[PDB]
Every structure is written in structure tokens, then in C-alpha cells.
Design a protein around this motif. Structure first.
Motif, PDB file in Angstrom:
ATOM      1  N   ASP A  36     -39.240 -32.439 -20.683  1.00 30.00           N
ATOM      2  CA  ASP A  36     -38.383 -31.325 -21.071  1.00 30.00           C
ATOM      3  C   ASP A  36     -39.237 -30.057 -21.262  1.00 30.00           C
ATOM      4  O   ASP A  36     -40.253 -30.081 -21.958  1.00 30.00           O
ATOM      5  N   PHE A  37     -38.827 -28.959 -20.632  1.00 27.26           N
ATOM      6  CA  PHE A  37     -39.615 -27.732 -20.657  1.00 27.26           C
ATOM      7  C   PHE A  37     -39.306 -26.943 -21.923  1.00 27.26           C
ATOM      8  O   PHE A  37     -38.139 -26.783 -22.293  1.00 27.26           O
ATOM      9  N   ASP A  38     -40.357 -26.453 -22.578  1.00 27.34           N
ATOM     10  CA  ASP A  38     -40.253 -25.767 -23.864  1.00 27.34           C
ATOM     11  C   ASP A  38     -39.607 -24.399 -23.725  1.00 27.34           C
ATOM     12  O   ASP A  38     -40.008 -23.626 -22.864  1.00 27.34           O
ATOM     13  N   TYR A  39     -38.646 -24.089 -24.597  1.00 26.24           N
ATOM     14  CA  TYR A  39     -37.983 -22.768 -24.638  1.00 26.24           C
ATOM     15  C   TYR A  39     -38.018 -22.097 -23.251  1.00 26.24           C
ATOM     16  O   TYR A  39     -38.564 -21.015 -23.060  1.00 26.24           O
ATOM     17  N   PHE A  40     -37.406 -22.773 -22.287  1.00 23.02           N
ATOM     18  CA  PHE A  40     -37.698 -22.561 -20.879  1.00 23.02           C
ATOM     19  C   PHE A  40     -37.511 -21.141 -20.364  1.00 23.02           C
ATOM     20  O   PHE A  40     -38.431 -20.596 -19.758  1.00 23.02           O
ATOM     21  N   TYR A  41     -36.350 -20.537 -20.593  1.00 25.97           N
ATOM     22  CA  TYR A  41     -36.090 -19.208 -20.030  1.00 25.97           C
ATOM     23  C   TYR A  41     -37.032 -18.200 -20.668  1.00 25.97           C
ATOM     24  O   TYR A  41     -37.651 -17.384 -19.970  1.00 25.97           O
ATOM     25  N   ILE A  76     -31.621 -28.075 -15.719  1.00 24.69           N
ATOM     26  CA  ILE A  76     -32.514 -27.030 -15.260  1.00 24.69           C
ATOM     27  C   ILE A  76     -33.947 -27.220 -15.764  1.00 24.69           C
ATOM     28  O   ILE A  76     -34.875 -26.618 -15.215  1.00 24.69           O
ATOM     29  N   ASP A  77     -34.136 -28.061 -16.780  1.00 31.92           N
ATOM     30  CA  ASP A  77     -35.466 -28.222 -17.350  1.00 31.92           C
ATOM     31  C   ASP A  77     -35.805 -29.624 -17.857  1.00 31.92           C
ATOM     32  O   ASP A  77     -36.663 -29.793 -18.729  1.00 31.92           O
ATOM     33  N   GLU A  78     -35.138 -30.631 -17.304  1.00 28.55           N
ATOM     34  CA  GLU A  78     -35.378 -32.009 -17.706  1.00 28.55           C
ATOM     35  C   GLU A  78     -35.463 -32.912 -16.494  1.00 28.55           C
ATOM     36  O   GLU A  78     -34.782 -32.702 -15.495  1.00 28.55           O
ATOM     37  N   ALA A 116     -28.694 -17.147 -24.519  1.00 26.30           N
ATOM     38  CA  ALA A 116     -28.982 -18.364 -23.780  1.00 26.30           C
ATOM     39  C   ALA A 116     -30.091 -19.135 -24.487  1.00 26.30           C
ATOM     40  O   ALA A 116     -29.977 -20.341 -24.700  1.00 26.30           O
ATOM     41  N   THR A 117     -31.158 -18.437 -24.863  1.00 23.09           N
ATOM     42  CA  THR A 117     -32.252 -19.058 -25.593  1.00 23.09           C
ATOM     43  C   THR A 117     -33.185 -18.006 -26.173  1.00 23.09           C
ATOM     44  O   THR A 117     -33.015 -16.808 -25.931  1.00 23.09           O
ATOM     45  N   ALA A 118     -34.162 -18.462 -26.949  1.00 23.73           N
ATOM     46  CA  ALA A 118     -35.143 -17.589 -27.564  1.00 23.73           C
ATOM     47  C   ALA A 118     -36.427 -18.380 -27.758  1.00 23.73           C
ATOM     48  O   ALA A 118     -36.380 -19.597 -27.929  1.00 23.73           O
ATOM     49  N   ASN A 119     -37.573 -17.704 -27.716  1.00 27.30           N
ATOM     50  CA  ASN A 119     -38.828 -18.383 -28.001  1.00 27.30           C
ATOM     51  C   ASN A 119     -38.943 -18.761 -29.485  1.00 27.30           C
ATOM     52  O   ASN A 119     -38.107 -18.383 -30.307  1.00 27.30           O
ATOM     53  N   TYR A 120     -39.982 -19.515 -29.815  1.00 24.14           N
ATOM     54  CA  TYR A 120     -40.086 -20.111 -31.138  1.00 24.14           C
ATOM     55  C   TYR A 120     -40.320 -19.080 -32.232  1.00 24.14           C
ATOM     56  O   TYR A 120     -39.976 -19.304 -33.386  1.00 24.14           O
ATOM     57  N   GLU A 121     -40.832 -17.922 -31.835  1.00 17.42           N
ATOM     58  CA  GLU A 121     -41.160 -16.866 -32.766  1.00 17.42           C
ATOM     59  C   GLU A 121     -39.900 -16.126 -33.214  1.00 17.42           C
ATOM     60  O   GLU A 121     -39.897 -15.447 -34.234  1.00 17.42           O
ATOM     61  N   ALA A 122     -38.826 -16.282 -32.448  1.00 19.77           N
ATOM     62  CA  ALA A 122     -37.525 -15.739 -32.813  1.00 19.77           C
ATOM     63  C   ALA A 122     -36.640 -16.844 -33.376  1.00 19.77           C
ATOM     64  O   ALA A 122     -35.901 -16.624 -34.332  1.00 19.77           O
ATOM     65  N   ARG A 123     -36.727 -18.033 -32.781  1.00 16.87           N
ATOM     66  CA  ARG A 123     -36.021 -19.211 -33.280  1.00 16.87           C
ATOM     67  C   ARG A 123     -36.472 -19.488 -34.702  1.00 16.87           C
ATOM     68  O   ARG A 123     -35.655 -19.771 -35.566  1.00 16.87           O
ATOM     69  N   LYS A 124     -37.780 -19.386 -34.928  1.00 14.30           N
ATOM     70  CA  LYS A 124     -38.370 -19.329 -36.259  1.00 14.30           C
ATOM     71  C   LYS A 124     -37.356 -18.835 -37.287  1.00 14.30           C
ATOM     72  O   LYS A 124     -37.227 -19.425 -38.365  1.00 14.30           O
ATOM     73  N   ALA A 162     -40.903 -34.746 -30.584  1.00 17.63           N
ATOM     74  CA  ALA A 162     -42.186 -34.135 -30.318  1.00 17.63           C
ATOM     75  C   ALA A 162     -42.049 -32.647 -30.011  1.00 17.63           C
ATOM     76  O   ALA A 162     -43.040 -31.925 -29.989  1.00 17.63           O
ATOM     77  N   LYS A 163     -40.812 -32.190 -29.828  1.00 17.82           N
ATOM     78  CA  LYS A 163     -40.506 -30.996 -29.021  1.00 17.82           C
ATOM     79  C   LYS A 163     -41.564 -29.910 -28.810  1.00 17.82           C
ATOM     80  O   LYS A 163     -42.079 -29.795 -27.699  1.00 17.82           O
ATOM     81  N   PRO A 164     -41.906 -29.116 -29.841  1.00 20.89           N
ATOM     82  CA  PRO A 164     -42.623 -27.901 -29.416  1.00 20.89           C
ATOM     83  C   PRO A 164     -43.976 -28.277 -28.820  1.00 20.89           C
ATOM     84  O   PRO A 164     -44.917 -28.547 -29.558  1.00 20.89           O
TER      85      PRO A 164
HETATM   86  N1  LIG Z   1     -26.503 -23.024 -24.847  1.00 16.81           N
HETATM   87  C1  LIG Z   1     -27.532 -22.984 -23.942  1.00 16.81           C
HETATM   88  C2  LIG Z   1     -28.515 -23.958 -23.947  1.00 16.81           C
HETATM   89  C3  LIG Z   1     -29.528 -23.862 -23.003  1.00 16.81           C
HETATM   90  N2  LIG Z   1     -29.528 -22.842 -22.119  1.00 16.81           N
HETATM   91  C4  LIG Z   1     -30.604 -22.713 -21.122  1.00 16.81           C
HETATM   92  C5  LIG Z   1     -31.733 -21.874 -21.716  1.00 16.81           C
HETATM   93  C6  LIG Z   1     -32.687 -22.927 -22.269  1.00 16.81           C
HETATM   94  O1  LIG Z   1     -34.005 -22.430 -22.464  1.00 16.81           O
HETATM   95  C7  LIG Z   1     -32.581 -24.032 -21.221  1.00 16.81           C
HETATM   96  C8  LIG Z   1     -32.855 -25.432 -21.726  1.00 16.81           C
HETATM   97  O2  LIG Z   1     -32.171 -25.672 -22.942  1.00 16.81           O
HETATM   98  P1  LIG Z   1     -32.999 -26.065 -24.122  1.00 16.81           P
HETATM   99  O3  LIG Z   1     -32.119 -26.658 -25.181  1.00 16.81           O
HETATM  100  O4  LIG Z   1     -33.986 -27.102 -23.653  1.00 16.81           O
HETATM  101  O5  LIG Z   1     -33.640 -24.846 -24.747  1.00 16.81           O
HETATM  102  P2  LIG Z   1     -35.072 -24.368 -24.709  1.00 16.81           P
HETATM  103  O6  LIG Z   1     -35.800 -24.896 -23.507  1.00 16.81           O
HETATM  104  O7  LIG Z   1     -35.075 -22.866 -24.634  1.00 16.81           O
HETATM  105  O8  LIG Z   1     -35.760 -24.756 -25.995  1.00 16.81           O
HETATM  106  P3  LIG Z   1     -36.659 -25.986 -26.185  1.00 16.81           P
HETATM  107  O9  LIG Z   1     -38.094 -25.525 -26.409  1.00 16.81           O
HETATM  108  O10 LIG Z   1     -36.185 -26.768 -27.403  1.00 16.81           O
HETATM  109  O11 LIG Z   1     -36.673 -26.936 -24.996  1.00 16.81           O
HETATM  110  O12 LIG Z   1     -31.217 -23.958 -20.836  1.00 16.81           O
HETATM  111  C9  LIG Z   1     -28.539 -21.896 -22.156  1.00 16.81           C
HETATM  112  O13 LIG Z   1     -28.334 -21.161 -21.170  1.00 16.81           O
HETATM  113  N3  LIG Z   1     -27.559 -21.984 -23.067  1.00 16.81           N
END
Ligand SMILES: Nc1ccn([C@H]2C[C@H](O)[C@@H](COP(=O)(O)OP(=O)(O)OP(=O)(O)O)O2)c(=O)n1
Ligand SMILES: [Ca+2]
Ligand SMILES: [Ca+2]
Ligand SMILES: [Ca+2]
Ligand SMILES: [Ca+2]
Length: 341
Positions: free
Chosen positions: A7-12, A104-106, A44-52, A158-160
Motif C-alpha cells: 500500500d502506497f503512503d499518502y499516495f496523491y 490505485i495504490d494497493e 482526496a487526501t493529505a500528507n502526514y504533516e496535515a493529517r497530523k 504498520a502504515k506510515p
Molecule cells: N476518500 C478518498 C480516499 C482515497 N483517495 C485517494 C487518495 C489517496 O491518497 C489514495 C489511497 O487512499 P489511501 O487511504 O491509501 O490514502 P493515502 O494513501 O493518502 O494515505 P495512506 O498513507 O494511509 O496510505 O486514494 C481519495 O481520492 N479519496
DNA sequence: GGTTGGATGGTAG
DNA sequence: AACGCTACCATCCAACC
């Protein structure tokens, strides 16, 4: 049987970091702008520094801006993230012929013939993580267990950026200890229903009448959980195929005027067809999202592929049917193509 | 009663 | 002061054999 899940971290967010390294450190929020009014949209998503700070997926942009007003707000660019995903998935195939691209990321990888035991899988996991960081500079998280579900649960734990193994014992522990709400496939409705029956762990599906559970959550979810809880879940890694291509769009304003909704429908049709690319559908669906955010669709299946012009006719015939049969105002309109030749 | 397709429901990215 | 979008499988209900 040994499954490695990636699984790709905070992918977008991460793809943007890689593409614009100046972003590194700063909180990044990837957004979907509905366009209704200026800043109307969701995250759609945010990096860990904003998810924080509580800026998670799904919340409205406005509401994110209330929390982190100085974050970098970027519009979604799915086609870029897609390309990158595509390249990583190709990198993953160097490790298993049996590979299931989940989203898209798994990806699940059936490595049963590729390593002897979990030690070797762990080592392979490390190797895969480096290879991805090497080629595409994306950090990911690897989960390892005896089946798909527990591989994913391993990665959640394990995620981040990490790698976790769940041995035969820890599976057993989690059958007793893990919150059933945190079992892949169980969303808030089912969790609510299950807790509303007094089930918070996987184990206590073995304590109930099968027909009682089958009654609340449906046959499949019942047969699923039980299968897990019995340390028996063993669903094979299988190639998945895109079954539908479609597009729905938020209108500037709610409407029931056919002539006002049409251009939006056609903009969707042209975009769907562009994304079809050689794939010919025999089924079409017009999907309407009403004022109060409920989803309404009418479709048709032909004995042939649907041409651009046929979509144009039928989408109209079908939207007309939504307007006759549903009283509500329409907020989003779109189209969905399926049953490919 | 079982299959089937259309509509909806639930889930997760 | 309002709030994205994609897509998968399961269920529901009704026609049909
Ligand atoms: N409601 C959502 C959930 C996900 N996504 C997109 C953006 C995400 O980055 C990607 C994968 O979902 P993740 O739950 O895996 O989110 P992240 O990859 O961003 O975070 P993580 O680091 O936990 O994997 O799919 C989105 O469009 N809308
Ligand atoms: Ca995931
Ligand atoms: Ca992810
Ligand atoms: Ca859950
Ligand atoms: Ca029917």
C-alpha cells in the motif's frame, strides 16, 4: 500460503512531493474542486504533516482551511498519480506472476512459491520497498500474512512507511483481540449493526446463531467474518479487470430542467468515452445524485456495443426516466459504461 | 425455488 | 454557509423457467 500486500503512503500527496520536492516538509492537501462556488470541494487526501492535524480525506476544503490555513492546497491530478501507480505495479510484477492490483495504490502478491517462510518474505518486503524508493522515490508500506485480509491488516498496523508480518499466532491473537470494525470490508453501517448485536471482536461470530448474523449483515459478510474468525479465510490472488468506466459531475446549481442538465451529461459522456479507449460497452447508465445526496440511476443493456451517438440518445431517454420517476432536484449528473465486448 | 438483470446499498480507494 | 469523485461486489425485488 504467504501473501505480501503493498500500500502506497499518502499516495496523491506523495506523488506531488516527488514531482515538486519543494513541497517536502510542508503540509500538503490534495483537493477536489466541485466548482460550484470558489473553494467548494472535498479532500482526496493529505500528507502526514496535515493529517497530523485532523485534515483527513472527505472533509470539505473550507473546513480544512479553518484548521490549516497555510497548507499547500493542490487540485487532484488523477492521470498523473495513475501513471506513477502503473509504473510501480509493473515494478511489483518482478516479484510474482500472481499479483492482484486492488486499487490505485494497493497490490496483493502471492509469494508462496517465491520464499520459504516469513523471514524470507520480510527480506523480500524490504527489497520491494527499496526498489520502489529506488525507481519512483515513493515510500510505501508492506503487510505480510497468510491471506489477503490479514496482509492488509498487517499493513494498517504498520502504515506510515513500514513492513509488518502477522505470523500464525498473531492472527489467532487478533481473532480474539482485533476490533471487528477494523476488519477490511466492515464499514460504519455494518460495524454499527454488529456492535448493535454486541460483537466488537472477530471471535464472537463463533458465539452467535448463523441465521441471526446472516439476517442483519447479509449472507456474504456473515460467511466472510466466520471464515476469518475460524482462521480459514483463504481467497486466492487473482487478476482484476476494470468492469466499468464512467464520469459524474457537479452542476453549477440544482436542476430539473432537462435542457439545463443535458450539457453536463454530454460533458460526462465525452469524458467517459475518452477514458474507454478501445473498450466497447454494451450497457449504459445515467447516474443522478439528488439534492439530499442520494444516488439514482437508470441503465440499459444492448445486444451490441454502444456507439457515441447511441450514448447520446439513450442517456437522454434514461435521464428523462429519472425525472419522471423521481421528484427530487438533481445535483450531480453523470454516466457509467459497463459489460464490455 | 433458482437465475437473472435492474436498482439500490455498502464499502474503500 | 454551503462540501468530490470512482468503482467494486452484494442485496433486493420482480420476470421467468
Ligand atoms: N476518500 C478518498 C480516499 C482515497 N483517495 C485517494 C487518495 C489517496 O491518497 C489514495 C489511497 O487512499 P489511501 O487511504 O491509501 O490514502 P493515502 O494513501 O493518502 O494515505 P495512506 O498513507 O494511509 O496510505 O486514494 C481519495 O481520492 N479519496
Ligand atoms: Ca488501503
Ligand atoms: Ca495508501
Ligand atoms: Ca472499519
Ligand atoms: Ca427484471
Amino acid at each position: 500460503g504467504i501473501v505480501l500486500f503493498v500500500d502506497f503512503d499518502y499516495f496523491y500527496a506523495q506523488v506531488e512531493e516527488v514531482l515538486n520536492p519543494s513541497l517536502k516538509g510542508k503540509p500538503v492537501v490534495v483537493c477536489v474542486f466541485s466548482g460550484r462556488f470558489e473553494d467548494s470541494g472535498a479532500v482526496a487526501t493529505a500528507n502526514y504533516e496535515a493529517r497530523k492535524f485532523g485534515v483527513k480525506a472527505g472533509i470539505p476544503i473550507v473546513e480544512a482551511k479553518k484548521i490549516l490555513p497555510n497548507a499547500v492546497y493542490l487540485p487532484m491530478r488523477k492521470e498523473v498519480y495513475q501513471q506513477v501507480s502503473s509504473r510501480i505495479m509493473n515494478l511489483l510484477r518482478e516479484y510474482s506472476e500472481k499479483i492482484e492490483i486492488a486499487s490505485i495504490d494497493e497490490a496483493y502478491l502471492d509469494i508462496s512459491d517465491k520464499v520459504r517462510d516469513y523471514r524470507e518474505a520480510y527480506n523480500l518486503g524490504l527489497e520491494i520497498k527499496n526498489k520502489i524508493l529506488e525507481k519512483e522515490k515513493i515510500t510505501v508500506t508492506v503487510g505480510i500474512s497468510k491471506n489477503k485480509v490479514f496482509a492488509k491488516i498487517a499493513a494498517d498496523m504498520a502504515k506510515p512507511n513500514g513492513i509488518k508480518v502477522i505470523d500464525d499466532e498473531e492472527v489467532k491473537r487478533l481473532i480474539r483481540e482485533l476490533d471487528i470494525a477494523d476488519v477490511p470490508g466492515i464499514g460504519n453501517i455494518t460495524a454499527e449493526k454488529l456492535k448493535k448485536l454486541g460483537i466488537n471482536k472477530l471471535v464472537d461470530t463463533l458465539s452467535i446463531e448463523f441465521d441471526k448474523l446472516k439476517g442483519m449483515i447479509g449472507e456474504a459478510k456473515a460467511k466472510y467474518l466466520i471464515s476469518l474468525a475460524r482462521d480459514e479465510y483463504n481467497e486466492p490472488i487473482r487478476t482484476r479487470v476494470r468492469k466499468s468506466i464512467g464520469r459524474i459531475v457537479t452542476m453549477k446549481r440544482n436542476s430539473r430542467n432537462l435542457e439545463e442538465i443535458k450539457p453536463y451529461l454530454f460533458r460526462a459522456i465525452e469524458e467517459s468515452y475518452y477514458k474507454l479507449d478501445k473498450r466497447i460497452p454494451k450497457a449504459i447508465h445515467v447516474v443522478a445524485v439528488t439534492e439530499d445526496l442520494d444516488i439514482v440511476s437508470r441503465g440499459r443493456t444492448f445486444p451490441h456495443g454502444i456507439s457515441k451517438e447511441t450514448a447520446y440518445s439513450e442517456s437522454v431517454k434514461l435521464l428523462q426516466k429519472i425525472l419522471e420517476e423521481d421528484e427530487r432536484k438533481i445535483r450531480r449528473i453523470g454516466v457509467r459504461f459497463s459489460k464490455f465486448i
